[PDB]
Amino acid sequence: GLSRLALEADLRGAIGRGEITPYFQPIVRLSTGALSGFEALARWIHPRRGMLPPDEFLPLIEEMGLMSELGAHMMHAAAQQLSTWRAAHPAMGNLTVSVNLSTGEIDRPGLVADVAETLRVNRLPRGALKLEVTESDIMRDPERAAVILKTLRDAGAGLALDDFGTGFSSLSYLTRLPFDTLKIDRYFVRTMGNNAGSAKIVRSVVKLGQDLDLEVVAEGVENAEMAHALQSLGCDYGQGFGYAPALSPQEAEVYLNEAYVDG
Numbered sequence: 001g002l003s004r005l006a007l008e009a010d011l012r013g014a015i016g017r018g019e020i021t022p023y024f025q026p027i028v029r030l031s032t033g034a035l036s037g038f039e040a041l042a043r044w045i046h047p048r049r050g051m052l053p054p055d056e057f058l059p060l061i062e063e064m065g066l067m068s069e070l071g072a073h074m075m076h077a078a079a080q081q082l083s084t085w086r087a088a089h090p091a092m093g094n095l096t097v098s099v100n101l102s103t104g105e106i107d108r109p110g111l112v113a114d115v116a117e118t119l120r121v122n123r124l125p126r127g128a129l130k131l132e133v134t135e136s137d138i139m140r141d142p143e144r145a146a147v148i149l150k151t152l153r154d155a156g157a158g159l160a161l162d163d164f165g166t167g168f169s170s171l172s173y174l175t176r177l178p179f180d181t182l183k184i185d186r187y188f189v190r191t192m193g194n195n196a197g198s199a200k201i202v203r204s205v206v207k208l209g210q211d212l213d214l215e216v217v218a219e220g221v222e223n224a225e226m227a228h229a230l231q232s233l234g235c236d237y238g239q240g241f242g243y244a245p246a247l248s249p250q251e252a253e254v255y256l257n258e259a260y261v262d263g
């Protein structure tokens, strides 16, 4: 309990010190493996414990009431990294960076202005920074969310629905929420091979994506066979260990540059 308490206390200063920082997992076109963007995922590079994963620390951030602070940091850091990459590769194709919105953030006063500020200082074009919003956050009050999403889109953010299948039936409300991207949870991707229900959900979501004109991104693409299975079903984008995990910025840079060189 003491080690956990020590870590919790460390959150007083860790966010400000930049120790909780984004790593970047590639999102690729499955047909060719071409890079489309990255998802920024929080990593706490603890000065003594080394790299800690979000499942270990996000509950502590929640208990400490520091979700907004983490979210602001992650947004700024992802956006700055994107701006740095764009300045270094001015002739490159599109490259998006996605950031996970901290729960309860969607309806926090000031979020739209914070997003707008981030886009302006980083000179980003519309859609380059994408916000991944969780089903629970959206479905807690879908009409309110619809308006905030429109305001975020108008400010210049791209928008993704993350974690469908949490339990709120977001799929049947999706026609009324202005997302541009839908993510398929790795649970469905991992189980579609052996379970008819999961296979059915993935086929159906790809179809809804086509009919609502959303980009569909499969998460947890662990290998070549999952990638081909997804492509046959009409899923064109994916992220997973079959490509790369969330990479340090130095590794991500090599990764993107190699994609730019063979584009």
Ligand SMILES: Nc1nc2c(ncn2[C@@H]2O[C@@H]3COP(=O)(O)O[C@H]4[C@@H](O)[C@H](n5cnc6c(=O)[nH]c(N)nc65)O[C@@H]4COP(=O)(O)O[C@H]3[C@H]2O)c(=O)[nH]1
Binding pocket: 025, 040, 041, 042, 053, 054, 055, 058, 070, 071, 074, 100, 101, 102, 103, 132, 162, 186, 219, 220, 221, 222, 239, 240, 241, 242, 245, 246
């Ligand atoms: N086994 C397996 N896992 C794969 C594979 N491909 C991707 N993943 C993992 O799946 C998770 C995808 O992110 P998420 O669903 O938004 O799920 C995220 C998100 O809900 C939350 N999270 C991460 N970063 C942030 C952040 O900056 N802010 C907030 N609020 N939440 C975050 O923590 C969750 C866990 O993040 P991670 O541990 O980085 O775990 C990541 C990623 O590393 C694969 O092929 N196999």
Ligand SMILES: [Ca+2]
Binding pocket: 039, 100, 132, 162
């Ligand atoms: Ca996500």
Ligand SMILES: [Ca+2]
Binding pocket: 162, 163, 183, 184, 185, 186, 219
């Ligand atoms: Ca997800």
